Motif scaffolding. Structure first.
Motif, PDB file in Angstrom:
ATOM      1  N   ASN A   1      28.265  40.500  33.486  1.00  0.00           N
ATOM      2  CA  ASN A   1      29.671  40.246  33.186  1.00  0.00           C
ATOM      3  C   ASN A   1      30.184  41.109  32.034  1.00  0.00           C
ATOM      4  O   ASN A   1      31.340  41.527  32.038  1.00  0.00           O
ATOM      5  CB  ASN A   1      29.899  38.763  32.861  1.00  0.00           C
ATOM      6  CG  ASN A   1      29.738  37.867  34.079  1.00  0.00           C
ATOM      7  OD1 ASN A   1      30.006  38.282  35.211  1.00  0.00           O
ATOM      8  ND2 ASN A   1      29.318  36.628  33.851  1.00  0.00           N
ATOM      9  N   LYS A   2      29.332  41.364  31.042  1.00  0.00           N
ATOM     10  CA  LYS A   2      29.732  42.198  29.911  1.00  0.00           C
ATOM     11  C   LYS A   2      29.920  43.640  30.367  1.00  0.00           C
ATOM     12  O   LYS A   2      30.823  44.336  29.906  1.00  0.00           O
ATOM     13  CB  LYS A   2      28.691  42.127  28.792  1.00  0.00           C
ATOM     14  CG  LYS A   2      28.782  40.840  27.987  1.00  0.00           C
ATOM     15  CD  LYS A   2      27.692  40.740  26.937  1.00  0.00           C
ATOM     16  CE  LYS A   2      27.768  39.391  26.219  1.00  0.00           C
ATOM     17  NZ  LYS A   2      26.605  39.166  25.321  1.00  0.00           N
ATOM     18  N   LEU A   3      29.062  44.084  31.274  1.00  0.00           N
ATOM     19  CA  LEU A   3      29.173  45.438  31.801  1.00  0.00           C
ATOM     20  C   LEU A   3      30.499  45.531  32.557  1.00  0.00           C
ATOM     21  O   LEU A   3      31.274  46.460  32.356  1.00  0.00           O
ATOM     22  CB  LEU A   3      27.992  45.736  32.733  1.00  0.00           C
ATOM     23  CG  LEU A   3      26.653  45.957  32.020  1.00  0.00           C
ATOM     24  CD1 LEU A   3      25.496  45.876  33.008  1.00  0.00           C
ATOM     25  CD2 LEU A   3      26.681  47.311  31.336  1.00  0.00           C
ATOM     26  N   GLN A   4      30.755  44.550  33.416  1.00  0.00           N
ATOM     27  CA  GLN A   4      31.988  44.503  34.195  1.00  0.00           C
ATOM     28  C   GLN A   4      33.197  44.560  33.270  1.00  0.00           C
ATOM     29  O   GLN A   4      34.110  45.348  33.485  1.00  0.00           O
ATOM     30  CB  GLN A   4      32.038  43.217  35.029  1.00  0.00           C
ATOM     31  CG  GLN A   4      33.369  42.949  35.732  1.00  0.00           C
ATOM     32  CD  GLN A   4      33.781  44.063  36.679  1.00  0.00           C
ATOM     33  OE1 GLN A   4      32.946  44.659  37.357  1.00  0.00           O
ATOM     34  NE2 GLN A   4      35.080  44.335  36.742  1.00  0.00           N
ATOM     35  N   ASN A   5      33.192  43.725  32.236  1.00  0.00           N
ATOM     36  CA  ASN A   5      34.297  43.683  31.284  1.00  0.00           C
ATOM     37  C   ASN A   5      34.484  44.997  30.532  1.00  0.00           C
ATOM     38  O   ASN A   5      35.564  45.275  30.011  1.00  0.00           O
ATOM     39  CB  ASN A   5      34.083  42.539  30.291  1.00  0.00           C
ATOM     40  CG  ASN A   5      34.221  41.174  30.943  1.00  0.00           C
ATOM     41  OD1 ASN A   5      33.809  40.160  30.380  1.00  0.00           O
ATOM     42  ND2 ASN A   5      34.813  41.139  32.131  1.00  0.00           N
TER      43      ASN A   5
ATOM     44  N   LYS B   1      24.180  38.685  41.561  1.00  0.00           N
ATOM     45  CA  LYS B   1      25.029  38.272  42.677  1.00  0.00           C
ATOM     46  C   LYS B   1      26.139  37.305  42.266  1.00  0.00           C
ATOM     47  O   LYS B   1      27.221  37.329  42.845  1.00  0.00           O
ATOM     48  CB  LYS B   1      24.179  37.635  43.787  1.00  0.00           C
ATOM     49  CG  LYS B   1      23.210  38.595  44.477  1.00  0.00           C
ATOM     50  CD  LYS B   1      22.322  37.846  45.471  1.00  0.00           C
ATOM     51  CE  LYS B   1      21.245  38.741  46.059  1.00  0.00           C
ATOM     52  NZ  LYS B   1      21.798  39.842  46.900  1.00  0.00           N
ATOM     53  N   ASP B   2      25.876  36.454  41.275  1.00  0.00           N
ATOM     54  CA  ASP B   2      26.883  35.497  40.812  1.00  0.00           C
ATOM     55  C   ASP B   2      27.789  36.081  39.731  1.00  0.00           C
ATOM     56  O   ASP B   2      28.686  35.398  39.245  1.00  0.00           O
ATOM     57  CB  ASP B   2      26.228  34.226  40.251  1.00  0.00           C
ATOM     58  CG  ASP B   2      25.514  33.400  41.318  1.00  0.00           C
ATOM     59  OD1 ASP B   2      25.781  33.598  42.523  1.00  0.00           O
ATOM     60  OD2 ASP B   2      24.691  32.538  40.947  1.00  0.00           O
ATOM     61  N   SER B   3      27.563  37.334  39.355  1.00  0.00           N
ATOM     62  CA  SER B   3      28.367  37.963  38.308  1.00  0.00           C
ATOM     63  C   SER B   3      29.724  38.472  38.795  1.00  0.00           C
ATOM     64  O   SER B   3      30.026  38.415  39.986  1.00  0.00           O
ATOM     65  CB  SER B   3      27.595  39.127  37.680  1.00  0.00           C
ATOM     66  OG  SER B   3      27.547  40.246  38.549  1.00  0.00           O
ATOM     67  N   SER B   4      30.530  38.977  37.862  1.00  0.00           N
ATOM     68  CA  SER B   4      31.852  39.506  38.189  1.00  0.00           C
ATOM     69  C   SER B   4      31.833  41.005  38.490  1.00  0.00           C
ATOM     70  O   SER B   4      32.882  41.610  38.695  1.00  0.00           O
ATOM     71  CB  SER B   4      32.823  39.243  37.036  1.00  0.00           C
ATOM     72  OG  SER B   4      32.335  39.822  35.838  1.00  0.00           O
ATOM     73  N   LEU B   5      30.650  41.609  38.512  1.00  0.00           N
ATOM     74  CA  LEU B   5      30.555  43.034  38.806  1.00  0.00           C
ATOM     75  C   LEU B   5      31.204  43.334  40.152  1.00  0.00           C
ATOM     76  O   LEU B   5      30.854  42.730  41.168  1.00  0.00           O
ATOM     77  CB  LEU B   5      29.093  43.486  38.839  1.00  0.00           C
ATOM     78  CG  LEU B   5      28.368  43.632  37.499  1.00  0.00           C
ATOM     79  CD1 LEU B   5      26.896  43.923  37.752  1.00  0.00           C
ATOM     80  CD2 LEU B   5      28.998  44.759  36.687  1.00  0.00           C
TER      81      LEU B   5
END
Ligand SMILES: *[C@@H]1O[C@H](CO)[C@@H](O)[C@H](O)[C@H]1NC(C)=O
Length: 332
Positions: A118-122, A165-169
């Motif tokens: 999620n941090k990577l995505q953000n 898989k459950d992340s926001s990526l």
């Protein structure tokens, strides 16, 4: 032919901070990511450590260089070591603070992976590849996930995969399992067979099988053995395959092990690196779903032997200038 033509450039900021000024083959100063891109590289691999004391390779360190890679048009391959330091077949040290019991460790691993994703995505970073562990041939998160506790290993890997898989990526990355000694079919088969038979981690939980392939840790690492091993892996599990770590020396005065027979004619020089890298690349391409090749730390000039018995495995001069062998990524 290869989908991924890359290198692990993790040490980039460490070296720049140590005073290294990278230069192109023309001899002019230029950001490393731009030099790599100019030479055909389309993906960079980066090692991620949980809470290293000095901060090197932690998540913030990786987000900063991932942003630079993105700006240079390079995709990012995140290599989670799930440790505060180097993770290899002989070291899978538990991150400080993490619980040892399987129930809680599995949950921690999930939280950590989900959080990192999620941090990577953000940060606007969507890695094209994410390996859940580095060379986990002897397991991970010791002693809990140490082989032969296949049940714990499968469970831990299941938690890690679903953390992604459950992340926001978005888009989601390809999930990779990375083992060392790619040429060793017996071990590859032994590992995957026992892990998959547990019933927790399923084949559908991951997408790629990555292997390390080095010529200086055993004469058994022939190109033919690699070919046969990868072919076997492909026919058995039909997953995308990639050599995620490899090196060829421009200098090797006194090796600890004899070199593989089918590479003894290759000279220790930039020309030799070009030949070796191209050959390994084409071995991968000759394999069903063989899609990538990554050279390990070509620019770490202050650690030239790269942990091996050979003197120099880098693809840059001691002054920080890219060697002629770097353009090999333009032809594979
Ligand atoms: C995982 O995260 C959840 C939600 O934040 C939390 O309730 C749980 O305690 C965490 N598990 C571990 C072992 O850290």
């Amino acid at each position: 032919a290869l989908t991924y033509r890359g290198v692990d450039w993790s040490s980039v900021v460490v070296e720049e901070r140590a005073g290294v000024s990278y230069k192109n083959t023309n001899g002019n100063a230029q950001p490393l990511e731009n030099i790599l891109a100019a030479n055909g590289v389309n993906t960079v691999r980066q090692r991620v450590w949980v809470n290293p004391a000095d901060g090197n390779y932690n998540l913030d360190y990786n987000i900063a260089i991932a942003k630079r890679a993105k700006a240079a048009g390079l995709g990012v391959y995140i290599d989670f070591h799930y440790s505060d330091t180097w993770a290899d077949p002989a070291h899978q040290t538990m991150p400080a603070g993490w619980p040892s019991d399987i129930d809680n460790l599995s949950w921690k691993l999930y939280n950590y992976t989900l959080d990192a994703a999620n941090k990577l995505q953000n940060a606007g970073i969507q890695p094209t590849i994410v390996s859940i562990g580095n060379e986990i041939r002897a397991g991970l998160l010791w002693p809990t996930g140490r082989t032969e506790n296949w049940a714990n290993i499968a469970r831990l890997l299941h938690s890690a995969a679903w953390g992604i898989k459950d992340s926001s990526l978005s888009p989601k990355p390809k999930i990779m399992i990375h083992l060392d000694n790619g040429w060793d079919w017996g071990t590859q088969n032994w590992w995957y067979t026992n892990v998959l038979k547990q019933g927790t981690l399923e084949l559908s939980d991951f997408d790629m099988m990555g292997v390390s392939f080095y010529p200086f840790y055993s004469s058994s690492a022939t190109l033919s053995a690699l070919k046969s091993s990868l072919d076997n892996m492909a026919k058995t599990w039909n997953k995308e395959i990639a050599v995620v770590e490899t090196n060829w020396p421009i200098s090797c005065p006194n090796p600890r092990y004899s070199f593989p027979s089918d590479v003894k004619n290759i000279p220790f020089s930039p020309e030799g690196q070009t030949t070796f890298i191209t050959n390994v690349a084409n071995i991968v391409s000759s394999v069903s779903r063989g899609v990538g090749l990554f050279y390990w730390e070509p620019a770490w000039i202050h650690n030239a032997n790269l942990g091996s018995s050979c003197a120099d495995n880098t693809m840059f001069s001691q002054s920080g200038q890219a060697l002629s062998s770097l353009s090999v990524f333009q032809r594979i």
